[PDB]
Amino acid sequence: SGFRKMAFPSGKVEGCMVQVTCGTTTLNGLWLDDVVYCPRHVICTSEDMLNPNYEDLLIRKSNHNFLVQAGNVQLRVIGHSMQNCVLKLKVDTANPKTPKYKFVRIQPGQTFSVLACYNGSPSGVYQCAMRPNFTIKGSFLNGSCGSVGFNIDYDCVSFCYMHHMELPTGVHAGTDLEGNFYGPFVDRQTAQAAGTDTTITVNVLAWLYAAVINGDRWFLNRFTTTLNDFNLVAMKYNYEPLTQDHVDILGPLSAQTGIAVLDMCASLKELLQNGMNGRTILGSALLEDEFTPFDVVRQCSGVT
Amino acid sequence: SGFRKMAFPSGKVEGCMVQVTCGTTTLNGLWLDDVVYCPRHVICTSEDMLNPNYEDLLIRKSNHNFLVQAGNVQLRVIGHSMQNCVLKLKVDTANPKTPKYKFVRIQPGQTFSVLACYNGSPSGVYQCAMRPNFTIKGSFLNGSCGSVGFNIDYDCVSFCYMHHMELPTGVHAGTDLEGNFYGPFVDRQTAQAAGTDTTITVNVLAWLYAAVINGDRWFLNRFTTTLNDFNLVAMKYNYEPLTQDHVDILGPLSAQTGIAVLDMCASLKELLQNGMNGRTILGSALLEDEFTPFDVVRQCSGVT
Ligand SMILES: Cc1ccncc1NC(=O)C1(c2cccc(Cl)c2)CC(=O)C1
Ligand SMILES: Cc1ccncc1NC(=O)C1(c2cccc(Cl)c2)CC(=O)C1
Numbered sequence: 222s223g224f225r226k227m228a229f230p231s232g233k234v235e236g237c238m239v240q241v242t243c244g245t246t247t248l249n250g251l252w253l254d255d256v257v258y259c260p261r262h263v264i265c266t267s268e269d270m271l272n273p274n275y276e277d278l279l280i281r282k283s284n285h286n287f288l289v290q291a292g293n294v295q296l297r298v299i300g301h302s303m304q305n306c307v308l309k310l311k312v313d314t315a316n317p318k319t320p321k322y323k324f325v326r327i328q329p330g331q332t333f334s335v336l337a338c339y340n341g342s343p344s345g346v347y348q349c350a351m352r353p354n355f356t357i358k359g360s361f362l363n364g365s366c367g368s369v370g371f372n373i374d375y376d377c378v379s380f381c382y383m384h385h386m387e388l389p390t391g392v393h394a395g396t397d398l399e400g401n402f403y404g405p406f407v408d409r410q411t412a413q414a415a416g417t418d419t420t421i422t423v424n425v426l427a428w429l430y431a432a433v434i435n436g437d438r439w440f441l442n443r444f445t446t447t448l449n450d451f452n453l454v455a456m457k458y459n460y461e462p463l464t465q466d467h468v469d470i471l472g473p474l475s476a477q478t479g480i481a482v483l484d485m486c487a488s489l490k491e492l493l494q495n496g497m498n499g500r501t502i503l504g505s506a507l508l509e510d511e512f513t514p515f516d517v518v519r520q521c522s523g524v525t
Numbered sequence: 526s527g528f529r530k531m532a533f534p535s536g537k538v539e540g541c542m543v544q545v546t547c548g549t550t551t552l553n554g555l556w557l558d559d560v561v562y563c564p565r566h567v568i569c570t571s572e573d574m575l576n577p578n579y580e581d582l583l584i585r586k587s588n589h590n591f592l593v594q595a596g597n598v599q600l601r602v603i604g605h606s607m608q609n610c611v612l613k614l615k616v617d618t619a620n621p622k623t624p625k626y627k628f629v630r631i632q633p634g635q636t637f638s639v640l641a642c643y644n645g646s647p648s649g650v651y652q653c654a655m656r657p658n659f660t661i662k663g664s665f666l667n668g669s670c671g672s673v674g675f676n677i678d679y680d681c682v683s684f685c686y687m688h689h690m691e692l693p694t695g696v697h698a699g700t701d702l703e704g705n706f707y708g709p710f711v712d713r714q715t716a717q718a719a720g721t722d723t724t725i726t727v728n729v730l731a732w733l734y735a736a737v738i739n740g741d742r743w744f745l746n747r748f749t750t751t752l753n754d755f756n757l758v759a760m761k762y763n764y765e766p767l768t769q770d771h772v773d774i775l776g777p778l779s780a781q782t783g784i785a786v787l788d789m790c791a792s793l794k795e796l797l798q799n800g801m802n803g804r805t806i807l808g809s810a811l812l813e814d815e816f817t818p819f820d821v822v823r824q825c826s827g828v829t
Contacts, residue, residue, distance in 0.1 A: 222695035225664040227649035230640060232536030336534060342829035345531035346650055358808065360529040362827045391526035391740060436695060496803070497810075504662065506801075506810030523666045525646035 224431045224503050226511065227520060228334035228348040229373040236318030239296070240341030241310070241367065242288040249338040249367030250289060250310070251380070251398070253319050257289050257296070257310040258398060259367045260385045261303055262408050270410035279303055284310075290341060291316070305400030306408050307383065321377040324398035329353040330421040330461070332513050333370040333381050337361060350424070350511040351382075353461055354416040355404025356392040359384070369398075375525075388415055420460045420510045423467035426485050427514040430474035432502045434521050439500060441480070444487035451486040458493045470514045477521075528735045528807050530815065531824060532638035532652040533677040540622030543600070544645030545614070545671065546592040553642040553671030554593060554614070555684070555702070557623050561593050561600070561614040562702060563671045564689045565607055566712050574714035583607055588614075594645060595620070609704030610712050611687065625681040628702035633657040634725040634765070636817050637674040637685050641665060654728070654815040655686075657765055658720040659708025660696040663688070673702075679829075692719055724764045724814045727771035730789050731818040734778035736806045738825050743804060745784070748791035755790040762797045774818045781825075 241250040243263045250259035262270065264278045282301070287310050289296040300311030327333065332350040336343050337360060349357050349370070361368065361384055370382025385395040385408055392415055394406040406413055433441065452462045468482045475482050489508075497506060512520075545554040547567045554563035566574065568582045586605070591614050593600040604615030631637065636654040640647050641664060653661050653674070665672065665688055674686025689699040689712055696719055698710040710717055737745065756766045772786045779786050793812075801810060816824075 222666070222691045223662060223664040223697065225649075225651040225653070225662075226530060227641070227651045227664060228532060230535045230539050230647035230650055232534075232539040232647075235534050235536040337531070339827045339829050343534035343536075344827060344829045345529075345824070346534055347529040347531045349529070358527060358529075360527040360531060360824060362526070362825075364827060387526045393527065499800070501811065504811075507805065507808075520649070520664060521666075523643045523648060523668060525643050525648045 222435065224435050224520065226348050228346045229371065231334065231336045231343065231346045233320040233373065233378050234336045234369065234371055235343050236320070237316060238336070238338050238341050238343060239289055239291045242290075243282065243286055247340060248364060249341055251367070251369050251383070252289075252291060252296070252312070252316040253322055255312050255315045257312055258307050258383065259310070260383065260396075260408065261306050261308045261400070262366065262385065263287075263308065272411075273409060275303065292341075306385065306396050306402060307398070307400030323377060323379045325379045325381050326397040326399070326401070327351050327381040329355060330424060330513070331381075332511055332516055333372050335359055335370045335382070335384070336368060337365055338368045339364045348511065350421065351403060352392075353419045353421065355406070356388065356394055356415045356418070357382070359393040361387060361393055370395075388413060390415060417459060420458070420508065422455055422460045422463050422489075422510070423470060423514065424510040424512055425460070425508045426463075426467075426471055426482070426489060427474060427517040428503065428509045428512045429485055429489060430471070430478055430480070430514075431512065431517045431521060433478050433480060435503065437502050440488050440492055440502060442488050442491050444491065445481070445484045446487040446490055447483065451483070451490055454490045454493055460493070473518055474514060526739065528739050528824065530652050532650045533675065535638065535640045535647065535650045537624040537677065537682050538640045538673065538675055539647050540624070541620060542640070542642050542645050542647060543593055543595045546594075547586065547590055551644060552668060553645055555671070555673050555687070556593075556595060556600070556616070556620040557626055559616050559619045561616055562611050562687065563614070564687065564700075564712065565610050565612045565704070566670065566689065567591075567612065576715075577713060579607065596645075610689065610700050610706060611702070611704030627681060627683045629683045629685050630701040630703070630705070631655050631685040633659060634728060634817070635685075636728075636815055636820055637676050639663055639674045639686070639688070640672060641669055642672045643668045652815065654725065655707060656696075657723045657725065659710070660692065660698055660719045660722070661686070663697040665691060665697055674699075692717060694719060721763060724762070724812065726759055726764045726767050726793075726814070727774060727818065728814040728816055729764070729812045730767075730771075730775055730786070730793060731778060731821040732807065732813045732816045733789055733793060734775070734782055734784070734818075735816065735821045735825060737782050737784060739807065741806050744792050744796055744806060746792050746795050748795065749785070749788045750791040750794055751787065755787070755794055758794045758797055764797070777822055778818060
């Protein structure tokens with residue numbers, strides 16, 4: 222009973238958080254095995270961020286300029302390299318708390334947990350999604366850079382995000398763990414605007430299935446629709462077009478509830494056209510799109 | 526930038542989760558030092574839950590009947606006692622991962638994180654609040670009993686909740702770590718109804734302050750009100766009466782934003798009377814009441 226925006230337990234990631242300082246700049250790093258990963262803008266001053274030439278700024282840095290502190294102990298830096306927008310600092314000690322891990326580059330619409338950190342110390346954990354415009358709506362302040370996003374499959378942590386910057390609109394941009402930005406963003410203090418923040422339709426449908434499973438059924442109607450008809454409505458409301466791949470992923474939720482995917486689409490169509498009329502679904506007064514079909518199955522089954 | 530429903534990092538609590546089995550019943554326990562805490566209904570069968578006499582059911586249980594497994598290793602049970610609605614199982618090994626901890630009994634309106642577990646294994650973490658009717662709106666399935674709620678002050682974990690049951694309405698009831706239920710609930714499979722779920726006014730005001738800090742300012746108006754005038758409106762909308770104690774706790778948010786508490790009350794009054802008119806505040810289409818003033822200060826300052 223009940224349905225909450227749930228994050229993965231963060232212990233495995235907390236054991237990886239370190240502080241990296243280079244000059245006067247301090248941010249977070251991720252220590253896995255004998256490598257510390259962090260945003261390359263750790264080498265920049267505030268003046269440097271306007272138009273940084275990272276290769277040139279890195280020439281003036283040596284291993285001893287990167288101060289890496291794990292809790293209260295100093296790690297010895299024996300190598301450093303830049304991979305895209307991340308720095309990889311080779312340290313002389315493998316992290317004893319390194320979990321089983323993978324680096325994955327996620328797709329827009331996919332959700333993950335973020336362990337927000339400051340000075341190598343965790344402050345909180347929350348769940349969010351890679352928006353279709355490749356931004357994330359997080360909660361990050363100055364010093365949170367290097368905080369990571371991840372998913373967990375039993376014992377394996379799949380790292381998918383490293384926080385780099387806030388856009389002038391207060392939305393967030395970052396990279397995968399190979400240092401490649403999600404979307405078109407660059408690690409420079411230049412105004413970069415985000416595209417249309419469309420709604421992740423397959424996630425809204427999954428959340429409607431979670432609502433039915435939990436007793437919120439008022440929105441179920443006597444209608445059905447087709448993918449093409451549904452998609453005309455989706456376009457009108459800045460919703461992602463629904464494909465047969467999305468219908469397929471909703472199959473287990475359709476099977477569990479006995480509500481055909483296209484019938485749930487017709488319920489969603491009426492909600493788009495008519496609004497909620499002052500009513501709520503799973504305690505929300507808007508259509509939630511940051512639960513994937515996998516998240517709904519996981520939460521509704523009790524996977525650990 | 527950004528404001529999210531953030532839970533505390535759960536690592537310190539994950540290191541305390543164990544599985545307790547008694548007969549055919551398995552639930553979660555909390556292992557701190559050489560004691561494992563768990564709901565006393567672990568000794569019950571499904572037949573026993575209709576009208577259990579816990580003292581009598583406990584006479585037929587010995588130390589060896591409580592199977593406690595920490596990850597994949599068995600703990601030796603050398604003592605057992607019942608304190609209110611919890612069992613305390615003395616084990617022969619102190620938990621090496623025991624964090625600095627306290628047991629606190631929270632007040633309605635206070636928020637905390639829950640580490641939902643199944644079979645001693647963490648599945649997720651979410652933030653919630655003790656409702657004014659002493660229920661919590663969680664996400665718990667069969668086997669989640671013994672999952673705990675907590676807050677963290679730097680290195681000290683303050684345990685405040687242990688999950689025991691779901692009401693027939695899908696809301697949740699549990700105890701503090703001394704085994705005393707929050708509210709009037711009893712650990713028995715008898716239909717128990719929850720009282721009025723009123724809105725935590727001081728939390729809604731704190732969340733309005735977080736909204737102003739983050740740029741969502743449309744709801745600020747040219748009005749002010751008094752505590753008594755505000756409270757007539759609060760009563761009409763099933764909001765908790767606001768007291769001078771609540772105004773005092775909002776002082777730092779008032780000081781940071783320059784918006785007097787009673788002016789924020791007048792903005793809240795207009796939102797109650799007029800609704801949001803299809804608009805959102807911090808991505809929500811309703812007034813959020815599960816952030817305390819302390820949570821807002823903490824999140825907006827970056828406390829680790
Ligand atoms: C202030 C803040 C809040 C939330 N999330 C991140 C930041 N930091 C930034 O955005 C900064 C930055 C500026 C341009 C490019 C890049 Cl890569 C980084 C300005 C710094 O200091 C780093
Ligand atoms: C099924 C579920 C979902 C979420 N949270 C808890 C539960 N479990 C219960 O409520 C059960 C129960 C019943 C009456 C009293 C008490 Cl103390 C416990 C029925 C069990 O099995 C334990």
